[PDB]
Each structure stands twice: as C-alpha cells, then as structure tokens.
Design a protein around this ligand. Structure first.
Ligand SMILES: [Ca+2]
Ligand SMILES: [Cl-]
Ligand SMILES: [Cl-]
Length: 295
C-alpha cells in the first residue's frame, strides 16, 4: 500500500523552506516532493517497503529544532467527507465555561478544574456539574456578553470548514460546552450542524445545572456514528480534531484523528498530532493545495 508523509508549518511562522523540504525527502529516500503551500506544507511520497514508523523518526530527526509537524498515512482515502470538530480551545481560543466563571468571580477555581478534566484526570460529567453549579444565579445576559467580548476564532477554522464544504463534506461542531455558544460559533465559522450540552435557566437566571444526560466522551463517538450513518458513510470517512481527553473517543474511531495542540496526556495517546500548525493543517493532511482553498 502506498504511503505519503506530509510536513506542516504554521502559516504565521512558515519555516518549511525549499532547502528544508529537499533535505527531508532525501532523508526518506523519497521519489518526488510536492508543495501544497510554499514555506508551509509539502507532500513526500515514501518509497514502497518503508514502515511509517521509520519515515516518522527519520523526518523528525532531520527536522529537529524546527516548528514543523510530521504525519504519515496511506495516500488513498486521505480526503475525508465528514469533519467532526471539538469547539473549546480548538475552533475558538477560549474555554466558554472558564469565561462564564469569570462573571462569577471564580475564573481561576473553575479553570483549574477544566485543566484537570481536559487532561483526563477527572471524568467529564462530574467535572461539568461541579463547574456549572458555581454559575448559579448568573443573569442570562452574560452569555451574549462573553460571546461578543471575549470569544475569538482559531486561525484557519473558517478556511478549513469552507474548503471542506466546497468539496462536498458534511461538517459538525460537537462540544461538551453549551448550545448557546455553539449555535453562534457554528454559524460564524460555517458548520452544517452543531451538538452540545444545555444550560438550564428559570427564564431570567442560570439554575446552575445542565440538562441530563450529559454529553461527554462517549457522546462524541455516538454523534460521529449517527452522522456517518445518516449521510450514508462510515466513520472511516471522517476526520476528527480535538485537544482534550473527551475528544479521544472520536479521534480514535475516525479514519483520521488529530490531536491539535493537545493536552500532554492526550497527545501522548493520539496516533497523529499537530503541535505547530493551525487548523489549515487539517487541509494539508487531506492533501489539499492552497489553490483549492476557499479564500
Ligand atoms: Ca476542547
Ligand atoms: Cl446553553
Ligand atoms: Cl489516535
């Protein structure tokens, strides 16, 4: 089966120089070298008979000290037809739950719990109830307040979703956060649908509870299964991306699963990781060229 290695830099620190790409491809006795974006990403088709683990270590040693990610995969079925993406710290810069906690004067106390939950040291569901209970009494106006003043989109997000939709993919934003945030964020970026938990309120204030059953790690796996079956595909046809322990189920089930700027224990578990590039990395992973992007 044919293999291809892809080298990916951050467009904001585009250090994949021509000379560097040439040296990488020689390190793996490669046939050709194909640029997907100048100074940012290139394809290196491995010669037949090389294990992916060899090419990976060879390329990483050659590139050591440079902010360039490495992934190796089979050339066929690179381009996926489903995207399922985590929201918090993946498509936006923030944790909505931590920003909400600010409005209760408890950002640090809640953020410390969030860090433990996204690292996998506590189960998602009791972590969520403990954090949300501290939001009891907040007026419903704080949701618009946080969205309009403190939530920012991750670089490359809109381009990723729009370029994939251009090529017929179905895109879903699937989050352990809250519907009141995902519905607006999904609209801003351009997802086909979103699914998240739900804050309970009395009409004026937050009750401090969440609608049950809570969506955690397994619920993201289930949404991936539901989507693929509905659109007449299989999870093998999907690329999944996240940063946290609650994304590892869908990252492991999808055909391509990406730990993006993941927590230390999370990245330790994922087969494919992106630590330097932004969300356009997922376009290059799939073999797209800059000429293909929606600008
Ligand atoms: Ca996340
Ligand atoms: Cl909500
Ligand atoms: Cl994985």
């Amino acid at each position: 089966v044919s293999l291809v290695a892809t080298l990916i830099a951050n467009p904001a620190k585009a250090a994949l120089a021509p000379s560097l790409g040439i040296k990488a491809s020689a390190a793996v006795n490669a046939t050709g070298l194909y640029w997907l974006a100048d100074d940012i990403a290139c394809d290196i088709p491995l010669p037949l008979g090389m294990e992916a683990s060899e090419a990976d270590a060879s390329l990483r040693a050659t590139l050591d000290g440079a902010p360039i990610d490495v992934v190796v995969q089979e050339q066929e079925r690179r381009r996926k037809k489903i995207l399922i993406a985590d929201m918090d710290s993946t498509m936006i810069g923030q944790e909505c739950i931590d920003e909400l906690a600010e409005e209760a004067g408890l950002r640090d106390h809640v953020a410390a719990i969030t860090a433990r939950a996204m690292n996998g040291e506590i189960a998602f569901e009791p972590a969520l109830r403990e954090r949300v209970a501290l939001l009891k009494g907040l007026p419903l106006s704080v949701i618009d307040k946080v969205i309009s003043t403190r939530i920012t989109l991750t670089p490359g997000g809109p381009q990723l979703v729009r370029t994939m939709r251009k090529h017929g993919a179905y895109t879903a934003l699937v989050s352990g956060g809250f519907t009141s945030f995902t519905r607006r964020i999904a609209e801003m970026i351009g997802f086909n649908e979103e699914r998240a938990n739900r804050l309970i309120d009395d009409g004026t204030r937050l009750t401090g509870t969440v609608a049950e059953p809570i969506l955690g790690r397994e619920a993201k796996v289930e949404k991936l299964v539901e989507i693929a079956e509905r659109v007449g595909l299989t999870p093998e046809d999907a690329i999944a991306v996240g940063d946290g322990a609650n994304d590892l189920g869908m990252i492991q089930l999808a055909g391509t699963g990406v730990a993006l700027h993941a927590k230390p224990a999370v990245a330790a578990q994922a087969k494919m990781r992106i630590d330097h590039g932004d969300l356009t990395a997922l376009l290059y992973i799939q073999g797209y060229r800059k000429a293909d992007f929606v600008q």
